[PDB]
Amino acid sequence: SECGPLQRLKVKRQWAEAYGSGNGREEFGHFIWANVFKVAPSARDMFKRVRGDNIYTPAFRAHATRVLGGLDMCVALLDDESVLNTQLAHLASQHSSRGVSAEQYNVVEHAVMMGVEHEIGQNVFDKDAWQACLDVITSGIQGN
């Protein structure tokens, strides 16, 4: 599937619900990362600076807070190609030296999807739109 204009509007609205104003953000982010480290425990070694050993800590919660903020920024720009790429480029820098495998990006991709679906319900979750647009976002993060 392609992350077209329509798919982008969809992802935006679904994300707005899932992410929300602020009260459910801690739990949303928790659910996502509990899934990442469960499916790929080896990934923890990369977060030694932000207590990747215990995602219940404030240090990691702050990290989870930045990651979600990252997705929010990209999703919020899915309709402004020019600015989206500049941003995806920034995120690319923040990771460029960490050796993130295409497999891990896919894992975090699935974590995020299960998290949004868990947030808005399997009843409305648009799988195709989400998969095509998140990959557009990860691709940018990995240079391409």
Partner 1 sequence: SSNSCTTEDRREMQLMWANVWSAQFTGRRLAIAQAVFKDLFAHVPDAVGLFDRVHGTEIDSSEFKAHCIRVVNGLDSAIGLLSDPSTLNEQLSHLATQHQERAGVTKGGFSAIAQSFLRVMPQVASCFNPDAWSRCFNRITNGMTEGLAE
Partner 2 sequence: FCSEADATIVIKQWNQIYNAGIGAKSRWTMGNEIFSSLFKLKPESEVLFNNVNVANMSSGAFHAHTVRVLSGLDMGINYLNDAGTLTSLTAHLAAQHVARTGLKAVYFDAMGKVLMTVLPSLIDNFNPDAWRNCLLPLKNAIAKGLP
Which residues are documented as binding site for Ca(2+)?
99, 106, 109, 119, 135
Q: Which of 21, 23, 122, 123 binds partner 2 (CB under 8 A)?
A: 123
Residue range at the interface with partner 2 (CB under 8 A); choices 3-11, 31-39, 41-49, 98-106: 3-11
- Specify the amino acid at residue 6: L
Pick from 30, 90, 95, 118 the residue near a second copy by CB under 8 A: 30
Q: Is 106 in the site for Mg ion (CB under 5 A)?
A: yes
> Which positions make up the binding site for Mg(2+)?
106, 109, 135
CA distance 36 to 30: 10
Give the chain's radius of gyration (CA, Å).
14
Integer CA distances (angstroms), 124 to 14, 37, 57, in order: 9, 26, 32
Query: Left if phi > 0, otherwise alpha if psi is -120 to 50, otherwise beta: which for 134?
Result: alpha
* Smallest separation (angstroms) from a second copy to the CB of 115: 13
Question: What is the rounded distance in angstroms from the CA atom of residue 135 to the CA atom of residue 86?
Answer: 17
Site map for ligand HEM, 86-125, x if CB under 6 A? -----x--xx--x-x---xx--x-----------------
Q: Residue 95 contacts by C-beta under 8 Å, 6 or more apart in sequence?
A: 141, 142
Stretch 49-88 residues interacting with ligand HEM (CB under 6 A)? 49-50, 63, 66-67, 70-71
Q: Which of 11, 129, 136, 141 binds partner 2 (CB under 8 A)?
A: 129
Interacting residues of 90 by C-beta distance below 8 A, sequence separation 6+: none
Residues that bind a second copy (CB under 8 A): 26-27, 30, 34, 54, 56-57, 122-123, 125-128
